[PDB]
Each structure stands twice: as structure tokens, then as C-alpha cells.
């Protein structure tokens, strides 16, 4: 399988290198056949003779066009002729662009700024991470001695921990009595040990959490001071710092450095992205945290190093376990987009769509649009985008609530109404659909570029999903599930990509229309559900609705909802489709994006209603949702505020674990005095509880 691809310069010529793994053996395949190029669109094709001899410059040398070739291409569907100007080196493209474009006969040039290594994979039709191979994965993390606001690297590396399928160990240079700790002469030898472990294990993928920014640079500066080369690459090379956007990543030749931090960021949203939080959110079970001050005290003492060696071992053990869960997802992406995992895992979802479309463009013989200019880029970043329909909810405490929503709404709209730049207001178009309120017309004679790709993606997902019912092989079933996750993520990225400033296939009109159509069909369901079925819609947001039959029986509401989805789907066009998603026993709605519901199992879901103060507002939700008693909830608030004045509540519950609030905290460096009360009522209890009770017409006066 193809793991990575770069290129090196030999005697002025570009040489591609395909880093591979085949039959459990590593090999590098060189390729000197490929040639970089750019496209030229001319007024007059006879003027090509003048364009052929246009000269450029680089490092004082003379850069010229080595070959030219006439080719038929498509541009936004419409046929077009272009000249393929070949060059010696990829780095000749900027200078040849500058001067070829200045020619009066040349109208524009295209596909001039695609990196050479990625150009090779697209053109050769090479997809990385294909086939079945036993890839060896290894994770690692490091513990450092921090002291003072000091330079990055002055503190010695206290521990280097690592973990794989078989084991999880710690390498250090102090006497510790643990069975997974390995003691060594000094820091220098600790680093040399780590190099031996990487050498013996010889991993295909090295996994870190935040390795680009912290672990590799800190190891490198340390290794520089100690006079020791980091022979981590499979050709003995050191880790190389490389840039992409506003990020400096770390590269390892022969292997794939997989930094987990970048994959978790664009996927799920959390308050903070610590290694402990991410582990708990994913796996459920908790992970203890040891802090810098605890490490600094225990290290210089010589005792209490068992606690730090535990934390360091678990850092490596957790990173491996997270890596094992997110890597199979990411290899399917890289296999779906068709670029290497090093790049794909550090790419934003908008840029992953770009690399997908550039590959597909080549399969369809179609010329890509250029990146926007700096003036065009800043223009797009200024414009605003109108969101989905949100309704001001019906207030009060409601019973037996059904939630209905659309399946893949925006993708289904893009396919049904053929929404893309190449079909926008097409000249000489026979049959077209008009977007509501915005009036943009999309041609439906031929399926466009993006709508056709997306339609195929959703087809392939259904095949995988159907085959998953059938399969009994657990390895296949889990493989299919990731393939299905990868396609889904990629498919939901297309909407956002249309409004993405940097995108080549940018189309605000397409994005306006997708949102506009979404608002039409949500309101259609709203009208059809309240008139023909007699329901009362409680709240609507973007692609889903909460509703019920006020005072109606629980079992009847479910039945009439399951009937409505069958009905409404007969009216909805193409891929548009509604589904029965869930049922709730009770629920109330304060305002937009602010509500709380409760399922039949008693589990209480919330949104917008967030942070003794956290305990009370949780106790308020329970008495409202479980028992349906708003008056009882008010008594609880009156009881809690009374305990604050009389101090009947115990200590510690009033404490907060974290120039500002830390004025008295800075002094601590080296039964009584329980006076705080007004603070806990005004700043903590009321703001949390009022957020809920405002919907039922209560004020600060009622509580206080």
C-alpha cells in the first residue's frame, strides 16, 4: 500500500518517491517519468507559437516551456480548448505563470498551483491506504520539568512513555520500582533508549496527541542541546517541521506521524480539548491528571515518582487507544479523498472536499477553477450567509412530544434540484428549478458536477448500510461502519464548502438556494402537520420539529406521527425525506436554542440551559420534567437561598476549582469566616435558575 509521497530534486530534475508497504516489507519506489504542467486558454489558437517560446527565470537560470499539447476539456460543463504547457520543475510554475499570462492572446491559466506530489496521485489514479496490510502503530508522550516563564526547551524531559498493542512502558532516569518503568543513566540515554524502541518496533504510524506543537519540537530542542541525532525516520533522518496553513506540523520520512489533536478538533465540540477530557468523552471511563507543580515537586525530591510514572504511562496508553479508534476513520477518508493520511488528518473539512473535487475533476476530463485572488478572497469573507429557519417556540410545559427531522437535508436538496455553479442560470437551458425567495435558476437537463458526485456518495453509503444488516464477519462489519462514517462526513461538508472563501468551486448562490429550499420544506411539514393531521408544532430548528396533540393520548400521538412521515414523503420531491426520530414524555421551550426535554427512560437532554448552583438548576429540571410541577421547583429555589443566608449548607460545595478573581489566590505562595452569601445568590443561583423559570413568567422577585 501507498503510505506517503513526496519529491526530491536530482541534477535539476524532479523525482517522485512513493513510500510503500507490501507483504509486511517497506520499500521506496522512485519515479522520473512524471512532468509538471499548467493550462493556457487563448483567444486565438494560432498564437500558441508565440506562447511556446515565452521565457521565465529562477535562481538566475533560464526557465522555458519544454512541451506544449492541445487538449479538449470541460469548464463548468461547457466544452473548451486548452494548451497544456509542460515544464522541467514544479517550481518553474510561478514564473511561467507570471509571464505567459501577460501575453495578449492568453485569457487565463488554470491548475498552476497544485503541489507536485498530490498532482502525481491524482493523475496516476493512485489511492493511498488501499489493500490489506498489517500496519504497526505506536504511540508516545513526554513529561517535562517546567519552572518559571522560561524558554521552550530549557526543562529536561523527565519521562518518555510509549504504548502499542502488546505493552505500555515509561522510560526515565530516576529509580522507580514499577514493572512498566525502565530506568536509565541520564536524559541523554533516555532519548537514545526511545530511539532504540522506535528502531526495534519500526512502526508504520507514530501517534501523538498534540505532537506537532509540543512533543516533537521539545524533543528536538532537547536533543540539540544534548548533542544527539533523532534518527526516527526510516532513512535515519530527523523529524522535519513543515507548514500547511497557519500551522507548523512535524513530518517523519518513511512513517506517518498521526497527531490526534487535529482530527478531534474538526469532528466533535468540547469546552476544552485536554487529553483527559477527550478520553472521557469518547470512552466514558475517566483519566486522572497530574499537574506541572505536582511533577516539579515529586521529581526533585526523589519520592512520589510512582504517581507521575502512572500518569505518563496512561498518557501513552490513552493516546494509543484514541489513535486506534480515530485512525480507521481517517484512513477511509484518505482512501476516499485520495491523498496521504499525514495531509488528510491535518486538513479542514472544506479543504478535504477541495482535494476530492480536484481528483474527480481529473476523472471527468474537467478543468478546475482557480483559487480566488486576494481581493476576491477578502470579498467572500465579508459577505453574510442567511441560516436555517428557527421558530420562536410555544411556551408552557408540554407532554408527549414527538421529534421529526429530515435525513441528510442539505445534501438531498443539492441532488434533487441540481444545485451547482455549472448549472446556475445556464444559457439555453430547457428545464430548470427556481430557488424560493432568492430566485436562482438551476438547470436539470444534465446532472451537474457536485450534485452527481454527492449522489454517487449517498448511493454507495446505502449499499454499505444494507450490506451491514447482512454481514456476520465482525471485522467486515466494523470496516463497513467506518467507510459509512467517512462518506457521511464528506457528504455533509459540501454545503459549507459552497460558502468557503478559499474554495475553487465557490457559489454563494448555491448556498443561498440550499438554505432557501430547506426553509420551504420545513415550513411545508409545519403546515401539513398542523392542518391535515391536527398537531401543534412546539419548536422548529433548521431541519427538525418538535410537536404533539395537546392532551392527546401517548400511544395515539406516536401512531399518528408514524402515519404523517409516510404521508409527507409522498409530497416531498426526489431525495427529500422525513423520519420519526424520537419521543419525549415531557418538555418545555424557553426561547430559540434554549430548551429541555426528557425521554421515557428519564434521561434529561438539554440545550442552551447550561452553567450548589449546578446542583440546584439540575434539581429544578428534575422536578419539572419528571413530575410536571413548576410550583414545586420554585420552592426548591426558595429553600436553597434560605440555606445560603443561614449557612445551613456544608462547606466545599460553595468553592470553585479553577488581574481578576485570583487576587487572594496569589497571596498563597509562601466553623468561622463563612461570610459569603450575597455572591452565591446573585452571581450563581439566580442566573442559572432564572434561565429556566423565565419561560414560565417568573422574575428575581419571586425567588428572592
Residue numbers in the entry: 1 to 611, 619 to 665, 677 to 688, 724 to 757
What does the paper say about this structure?
The replicative DNA polymerase from the hyperthermophilic archaeon Pyrococcus furiosus (Pfu) is a member of that polB family and is used extensively in biotechnology applications including high-fidelity PCR. We had previously used polymerase evolution by short patch compartmentalised self-replication (spCSR) to discover variants of Pfu with a dramatically enhanced ability to incorporate Cy3- and Cy5-labelled dCTP and replicate Cy-dye labelled DNA. The resulting variant E10, derived from an exonuclease-deficient version of Pfu polymerase (with mutations V93Q, D141A and E143A) and with additional mutations in the conserved A- (V337I, E399D, N400D, R407I) and C- active site sequence motifs (Y546H) was able to efficiently PCR DNA while completely replacing all dCTP on both strands with cyanine labelled dCTP (Cy3-dCTP or Cy5-dCTP) giving rise to highly-fluorescent products, termed Cy-DNA with applications in advanced microscopy applications. In an attempt to better understand the molecular basis for the altered substrate specificity of Pfu E10 polymerase and generally gain a better structural understanding of the primer-template duplex recognition in this class of DNA polymerases, we have solved the crystal structures of the apo Pfu-E10 and a Pfu-E10:DNA binary complex at 2.4 Å and 2.9 Å resolution respectively and compare them to previously obtained structures.
Pfu-E10 displays the domain structure characteristic of DNA polymerases, consisting of an N-terminal domain (residues 1–130), an exonuclease domain (131–326), a linker region (327–369), a palm domain (370–450 and 501–586), a fingers domain (451–500) and a thumb domain (587–775). The electron density is well defined for the N-terminal, exonuclease, linker, palm and fingers domains of both molecules in the crystallographic asymmetric unit, but some parts of the thumb domains are disordered. The final model for chain B is the most complete, but is missing amino acids 612–614, 669–675, 693–695 and 757–775. The two molecules (chains A and B) are very similar (rmsd of 0.8 Å for 690 alpha carbon atoms). There is a slight difference in the orientation of the thumb domain, which has a slightly more open conformation in chain B than chain A. This is likely to be due to the different crystal contacts in this region. The structure of apo Pfu-E10 is very similar to both these structures, with a superposition rmsd of 1.0 Å and 0.9 Å between Pfu-pol and Pfu-E10 (molecule A or B respectively, 685 residues aligned), and 1.0 Å rmsd between the Pfu-PCNA and Pfu:E10 Chain A (694 residues aligned) and 1.5 Å for Chain B (715 residues aligned). The greatest difference between the three models is in the thumb domain, especially in the region of residues 679–730.
